[PDB]
């Protein structure tokens, strides 16, 4: 307990640009010493829930391997990131398994993510044949043929574009604003530890 090392949570939580929900840029971190006090003490966190472990005794744990995945979402579906929850975003873009052990962090970011012209860098897919296996990316833009009619090339009726975009401008109310969502996924002490917080005395 010196402590010696550090890990760039200011790289993720203060990143100027986030990928949308279709190609969320998961980042795996190892050989770190991360302090959550700089995180939790931040003011505008309006949603901080955790499932596998209590948000109080985080600083006295060791993690086998941590994946931090960040993106943006609409507020209305923020409750959908919960494990086992269904709907639209938690069914066709990115969903969490029931055995999930990490935890999530969501807050309101209208300072920079809000766009007066709307969301035309982010989007969220609506059409897909099968429910994706948890924590699996999907980047293919294969045109989803809705009816029985096959179709390639351009859009139409029974032939729809598989992608739809949000619109996060300040006139949108609470729940319609850009809510950043980060998720930390880790396995709780089943392997030699490479990342542990400051072991306090």
């Amino acid at each position, epitope marked *: 307990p010196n402590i010696t090392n550090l890990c760039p949570f200011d790289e993720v939580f203060n990143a100027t640009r986030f990928a949308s929900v279709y190609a969320w840029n998961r980042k795996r971190i190892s050989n770190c010493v991360a302090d959550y006090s700089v995180l939790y003490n931040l003011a505008p966190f309006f949603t901080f829930k955790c499932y596998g472990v209590s948000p109080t005794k985080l600083n006295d744990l060791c993690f086998t391997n941590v994946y931090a995945d960040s993106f943006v979402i609409r507020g209305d579906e923020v409750r959908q990131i919960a494990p086992g929850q269904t709907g639209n975003i938690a069914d066709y873009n990115y969903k969490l398994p029931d055995d999930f052990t990490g935890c999530v962090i969501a807050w309101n970011s209208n300072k920079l993510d809000s766009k*007066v012209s709307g969301n035309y860098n982010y989007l969220y897919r609506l059409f897909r044949k099968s429910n994706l296996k948890p924590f699996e990316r999907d980047i293919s833009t294969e045109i989803y043929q809705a009816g029985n009619k096959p179709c390639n090339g351009v859009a139409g009726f029974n032939c729809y574009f598989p992608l739809r975009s949000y619109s996060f401008r300040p006139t949108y109310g609470v729940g319609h604003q850009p809510y950043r969502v980060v998720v930390l996924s880790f396995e709780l002490l089943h392997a030699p530890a490479t990342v542990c917080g400051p072991k306090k005395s």
Partner: antibody
Amino acid sequence: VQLVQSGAEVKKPGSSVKVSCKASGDTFSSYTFSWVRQAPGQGLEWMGRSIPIVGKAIYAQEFQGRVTISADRSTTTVYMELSSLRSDDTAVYYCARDQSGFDFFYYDHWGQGTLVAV
Amino acid sequence: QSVLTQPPSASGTPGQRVTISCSGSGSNIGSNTINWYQQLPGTAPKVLIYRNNERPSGVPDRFSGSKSGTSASLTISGLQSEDEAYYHCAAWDDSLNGPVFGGGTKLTVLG
């Protein structure tokens, strides 16, 4: 940025216009694209906006339907089609690139368009 | 033609501090910032200023923009003889969910 478009051509009333704008030196898809015309030596007024990411487009409510806007991400290009031209459409057309979709800064990167006389 | 009204012409002599004002309605200009644009004669128009207070890279600095509710005013000091051009004001009209541009001014730099 590096913006280019089609050359200037002259038409007659009752015709149709196919005009194109290309952007290079950046990621074409990520930025939305706006189309605005201006009569020679006259005021400015906005026509429409187009979304390379999706293809959804918005037009001026006073000019719905009579004009159409298309975009392509594989060839990375945007097009107007104009219908029912008249002397009121004698103007220069500009394809602008949004640098940021925020009130702090917007609608800066922007090209020299194409003049059209009817 | 737009909500943002604008006098048609403006004049300026060398070494003279000149002011140009653009006004609209509280629906759009009283709740959103204003951008100013320069239609230089004959060829591609160029940007002047965004958000009334900060300027892009490479643009000169004698332009001074300010906003007071309905009225946005640009002040020019040390005006040069090559600046005779159209000047326009623009704002993201929220009622129509689109950009709206001013009538424009003919800035004439008398010799």
